[PDB]
Amino acid sequence: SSRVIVHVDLDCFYAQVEMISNPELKDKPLGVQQKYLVVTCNYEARKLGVKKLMNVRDAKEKCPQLVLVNGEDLTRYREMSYKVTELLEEFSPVVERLGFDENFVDLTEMVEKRLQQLQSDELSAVTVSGHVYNNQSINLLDVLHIRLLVGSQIAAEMREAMYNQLGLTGCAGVASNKLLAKLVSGVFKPNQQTVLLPESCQHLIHSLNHIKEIPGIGYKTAKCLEALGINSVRDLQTFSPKILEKELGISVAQRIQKLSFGEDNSPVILSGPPQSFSEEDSFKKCSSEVEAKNKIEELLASLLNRVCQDGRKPHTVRLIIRRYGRESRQCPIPSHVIQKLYDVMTPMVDILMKLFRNMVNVKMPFHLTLLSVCFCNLK
DNA sequence: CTGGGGTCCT
DNA sequence: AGGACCC
Ligand SMILES: Nc1ccn([C@H]2C[C@H](O)[C@@H](COP(=O)(O)NP(=O)(O)OP(=O)(O)O)O2)c(=O)n1
Ligand SMILES: [Mn+2]
Ligand SMILES: [Mn+2]
């Protein structure tokens, strides 16, 4: 049976968070910077040619009057992200997160209830909320069109509630599966919404100019396909199943070829509480071991506060480094430390330092470009 | 001048 | 422990 799925992506998420805190940034072009990367920027900046994930120098060069704010601490962004997720969970309990600013909600049950409440007179009165992709004509006698229109109404209610209770704006897309909702949400940006009626699905899927634009096909998979003369959605649709499996494996091939047709049987999973907490630090150089112990101390402090806040306990710790391509060592967290979660710091530092020395030899000079710590295996 | 996070699979 | 993917 056919579902109704909604996808929500927040507008310039980090930048919008910053503009809420410091309204003086509301009308100036704003970029959010982590080290040498303008990770996002408000739409004023995008008018002047700034783009997401530009270099700082490319951003200032394409817009010298750009105002930069540091986004290396994701605390406020994370808080807001979960405020949005909890808000959406009021509508339907089952909400799936995709990173910090995107959410999927399966509206099927809700839509059915709303239709059950309706009589025959108002069925003619049902109207779309927001955009209809490709200006496709609505057939009120088509039940799928009716249900998707109801989904557009619920989506507008969600966006409005996000603005009224969280001051956040974003785009939504309503479709029959997660792939099509996520693809259709970004058609009209920012702070708009689009519904995709079934007849336009193929159109939407062929509007893409390369397969990498499909969620599920990343850099590596895209490269492997590029090497096979596959450059369009149709090249992947029309490629031979057997050859594709032989090159990419069975599961990957079948799934991504199903995606090239706009098909997504995957359900909306409940994300719930985080499966892991982590902190990262990048830098130009780290070669003094006591420097590394200081960085790990710093990461550990914040991680400890966050773990304390959740009220859940991690049963595993990891340490990740990058050498001047990424490597990690993990180990379980001793039970008495877990219970104490007391100067839990010093034992944690000792453990993570033993892992560090397992990874890298202090006797030989070394050059590390990233130190990250992860508390996972939460219970 | 290539961040700082996350998920699940193998 | 690493690898693929997502933002
Ligand atoms: N590679 C990435 C992608 C996103 N992000 C963060 C910064 C973004 O503000 C936030 C949301 O990512 P995004 O939706 O891809 N772009 P953003 O929401 O900023 O603007 P829109 O174009 O979506 O309106 O995740 C990141 O830190 N590193
Ligand atoms: Mn966004
Ligand atoms: Mn996003």
Same domain, A111 and A204: no
Q: Is A133 in the pocket of ligand 1 (CB under 6 A)?
A: no
A163 is in an annotated binding site: no
CATH number at residue A346: 3.30.1490.100
- Which nucleotide is closest to the Cα of A221 by its C1'? C4
CATH number of A111's domain: 3.30.70.270
The verdict on A210 and A247 lying in the same domain is yes
Instruction: Output the furthest CA–CA distance in chain A (Å, rounded).
Output: 82
Residue A352, annotated as binding a ligand: no
What does the alpha-carbon distance between residue A14 and residue A39 come to, in Å, rounded to a whole number?
9
Looking up residue A250, the CATH number of its domain turns out to be 1.10.150.20
**Are the CB atoms for A45 and A63 separated by under 8 Å?**
yes
A101 lines ligand 1 (CB under 6 A): yes
Cα(A175)–Cα(A192) distance, rounded to whole angstroms?
15
The answer to whether A319 and A328 are in contact (CB under 8 A) is: yes
Q: Which domain holds residue A232?
A: 197-273
Q: Which run of H or E residues covers position A205?
A: helix A201-206
For the CA of A136 and the C1' of C3, the distance in angstroms is: 42
Give me the resolution in angstroms, 1 decimal.
3.2
Separation between Cα atoms, residue A118 and residue A114, nearest integer Å: 7
Residue A218 sits in the same domain as residue A137: no
The residue written with tokens 């839509």 in the block is A111
Look at the alpha carbons of A240, A242, A246, A249 in this order and tell me if their dihedral is positive or negative: positive
Pocket test for ligand 1, best of A52, A54, A103, A192 (most atoms within 8 A of CB): A52
**Do residues A366 and A353 touch, judged by C-beta distance below 8 A?**
no
Residue A304, φ and ψ in degrees, nearest 5: -65, -45
Give rounded-to-5 percent helix, strand, coil for chain A: 45, 20, 35
For residues A191 and A232, state if they share a domain: no
Say if residues A94 and A270 touch (Cβ distance below 8 Å): yes
Question: Using CB atoms within 10 A of its CB, is residue A66 exposed (0-12), middle (13-18) or buried (19+)?
Answer: buried
Query: Does A133 carry a binding-site annotation?
Result: no
Could you tell me the two tokens for A15?
């930048």
Hey, what amino acid is at A77? Answer: Y
Q: 């970004």: which residue's tokens? A: A186
Q: Does residue A279 sit in the same domain as residue A171?
A: no
Select from A273, A303, A327 the last residue of a domain: A273
Listed by range, residues with Cβ under 7 angstroms from strand B are A 34-37, 39, 53, 55-58, 72, 74, 78, 99-100, 251, 269, 271, 274-282, 370, 372, 374, 376
Contacts of A202 (CB under 8 A, 6+ apart): A262
Chain Cα centroid distance, residue A364: 40
Give the whole-angstrom CA distance, residue A169 versus residue A161: 10
Whether A5 and A118 share a structural domain? yes
**Could you tell me if A194 and A200 are in contact, meaning their C-beta atoms sit under 8 angstroms apart?**
no
A19 neighbors A42 (Cβ within 8 angstroms): yes
CA atoms within 13 A on the CB side of A311: 1
Distances from the Cα of A158 to the Cαs of A70, A91, A180, A311, in angstroms? 30, 8, 19, 29
Residue A229 phi, psi (nearest 5): 70, 20
Cα atoms in the Cβ-side hemisphere of radius 13 Å centred on A17 = 21
Instruction: State whether A112 and A49 are in the same domain.
Output: no
Q: Which of A196, A222, A241 is the last residue of a domain?
A: A196
Does any ligand 1 atom lie closer than 6 A to the CB of residue A77? no
Q: Based on the residue annotation, tell me whether A44 is a catalytic residue of this protein.
A: no
Residue A102 Cα to ligand 2 middle (Å): 7
Atom of ligand 1 at shortest range from CA of A71: 27
3-state secondary structure of A346: helix
Strand arrangement of the beta sheet that strand A170-175 belongs to = A95-98, A102-106, A5-10, A170-175, A193-195, A131-132
Alpha-carbon distance of A32 to A13, in angstroms, equals 10
Are residue A192 and residue A212 in the same domain, yes or no?
no
Pairing of strands A170-175, A193-195: parallel
CB A196, CB A30: distance < 8 Å = no
Residues contacting A231, CB < 8 A, separation 6+: A210, A211, A225
Whether A113 and A260 map to the same domain: the answer is no
Residues A148 and A1 in one domain: yes
A127 by Cβ neighbours in 10 Å (0-12 / 13-18 / 19+) ranks as exposed
Residue whose pair of structure tokens reads 């997720």 in the numeric block = A85
Distances (CA, A) of A72 to A14, A36, A45, A280, A310: 10, 11, 20, 9, 21
Residue A147 φ/ψ, nearest 5 degrees: -60, -40
In contact, A178 and A264? CB cutoff 8 Å:
yes
CA gap A262, A280 in Å, rounded: 36
Total domains in the fold of chain A? 4
Closest CA to A201 of A133, A286, A300: A133
Shared domain check, A189 and A107: yes
Structure tokens at A39: 């990770």
Single out the residue in A205, A238, A273 at which a domain terminates. A273
Residue whose CA is at the smallest distance from ligand 1 atom 5: A39
Measured between alpha carbons, how far is A289 from A295 in angstroms, rounded to an integer? Answer: 10
Experimental method, per PDB record: X-ray
Whole-number distance in Å between A221 CA and B5 C1': 22
Distance CA A208, CA A191 (A): 21
Which domain CATH number covers A29?
A: 3.40.1170.60
* Ligand 2 centre distance from Cα of residue A108 (Å): 24
Q: Does residue A59 sit in the same domain as residue A131?
A: no
Q: Could you give the strand order of the β-sheet that contains A368-378, starting from the edge strand earlier in sequence?
A: A276-282, A368-378, A314-323, A326-331
